[PDB]
Ligand binder design. Structure first.
Ligand code: DD3
Ligand code: DD3
Lengths: 286, 289
């Protein structure tokens, strides 16, 4: 570990449906968050196991149906474990199970209400700039268009353990700073977006033998961090924020800007917000 | 402590969900078996103390204050819930099978030239839909109605929703007007209807179920499962299959698109997913190659 003597203070989030868990613990005795998530199945290896002598324990049996506790070999018991140390309060509040409400932000709402409250925050995204300057993860990079204006870095998302194509998930992070979200896009960025769309899908083709029509390529709004980035995901993966209330198809973002240059500055956008988020009351009123 | 058959061998992955950590496997034996494996929820106390003493952690990478590891925990945290169906009936194979999809980007021209012709070459029955509108079935279950035959609709719970809990709330708005096969048919002429469904249908869900409109995902499907305009109302906290960006279009935006661009849904490119063995997928893939 990057510390010793972990002691649970609080379960921040726990889902039996996603078999994922977020733990807040005190360490070195500082705050630390450890995320743990049971990994996806590897089909070839489950297949193999099931035609061997697997260690089973019989729960119940009714005619053609039977339930068993299976205890696989080490290979198939991998648990994705991510660690945040030192954890900020932003982290400790961010994961707390809180209820989600839907808001409809107009163009003017954004610039007069959101953007100011955005600027009222100071969140660290040093890890993004680290990827962009080759200060970290440099040799995980899958593809780079190195132009400071129209260029980007294609790289697997931390979420993806890269052990199977079912949950294929890369991000494309643009080199250009100062583009916080969908709200910043204009016809100026059409070349950056096309690069990400086409060069990004071409890289996935050659690297992983995965055709564009197996991918859902989108942007989050609101994003989890405020530096433009595109999500490349397996169409068959229920990826994070691929629901209509958050995901915007890249191809659609391009053709929008082509049809209506002010599109993402003028148009009303719908997204969720946590009820504990002060942005909501600020948007609800004005 | 053994499987009731021999020599498992994969025919087909009927279904997998990397997000739920669950796979449905069709395998042969010796004839047909289905094996369902689900990774199990964490026992938190086990994990807790483990992290205080010699966890088999292998680092994958790190960046700033973040690091990701492979953890291989001891046996009683590795339990996998294994359900087995032997023999698997052809029904069982049909129920679990989720077919591999493929994205298509359908242009206005592609639709008119390829998709509509194909749609018209079939006979899909919406008698069940007409019976609700006509009040020959499920009249007992209607939550709200705007009986106008042009801009009116019926709001009705979906089959899947038993109404014992608002967690998985799922109502459907079916418009009275006929001949609107999908999004592709929507022009500004339909805005009173669309606004009605949205504004009255939401109003109605607040009045009836005391559930506010900002707790609702309100959306259309494209492609739709039956070709008579309908709108899904679901509890936001409940991600119904279909709510994905590759299928769902929100009612709020569909309305505003028509306000901005009247020809939007006859003229723009729509993106959906078809089953990999859908004669329409092929057809479309040909006219684009
Ligand atoms: C979204 C962000 O993700 C990352 C953080 C650091 C390095 C990352 N490196 C890569 N390649 N891809 C990512 N998504 C990375 C993040 C923030 C807080 C917790 C967690 Cl679990 C994830
Ligand atoms: C798609 C079709 O949908 C319906 C068919 C008949 C009555 C329906 N009534 C309601 N309220 N809502 C629906 N979606 C209905 C259908 C076909 C086979 C099984 C099932 Cl579970 C559903």
């Amino acid at each position: 570990l990057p510390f010793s003597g972990f002691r649970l203070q609080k379960v921040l989030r726990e889902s039996a449906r996603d078999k994922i868990i977020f733990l807040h613990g005190k360490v070195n005795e500082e705050d630390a968050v450890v995320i743990l998530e049971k990994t996806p199945f590897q089909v070839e290896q489950v297949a193999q196991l099931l035609t061997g002598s697997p260690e089973l324990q019989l729960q119940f049996s009714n005619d053609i149906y039977s339930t068993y506790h299976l205890f696989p070999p080490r290979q198939l018991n991998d648990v994705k474990t991510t660690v945040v140390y030192p954890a900020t309060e932003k982290h400790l509040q961010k994961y707390l199970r809180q209820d989600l409400r839907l808001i409809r932000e107009t163009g003017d709402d954004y610039r007069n209400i959101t953007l100011p409250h955005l600027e009222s925050q100071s969140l660290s995204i040093q890890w993004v700039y680290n990827i962009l300057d080759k200060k970290a993860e440099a040799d995980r990079i899958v593809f780079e268009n190195p132009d400071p204006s129209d260029g980007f870095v294609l790289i697997p998302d931390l979420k993806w353990n890269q052990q199977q194509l079912d949950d294929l998930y890369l991000i494309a992070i643009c080199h250009r700073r100062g583009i916080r979200s969908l709200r910043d896009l204009t016809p100026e960025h059409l070349p950056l977006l096309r690069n990400i769309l086409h060069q990004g899908q071409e890289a996935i083709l050659q690297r992983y033998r995965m055709k564009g029509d197996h991918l859902r390529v989108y942007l989050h709004y609101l994003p989890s961090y405020y530096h433009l980035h595109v999500h490349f995901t397996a169409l068959g993966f229920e990826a994070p924020g691929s629901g209509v209330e958050r995901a915007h198809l890249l191809a659609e973002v391009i053709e929008n800007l082509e049809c209506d240059p002010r599109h993402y500055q003028q148009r009303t956008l719908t997204f969720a917000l946590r009820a504990d988020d002060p942005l909501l009351k600020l948007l609800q009123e004005a």
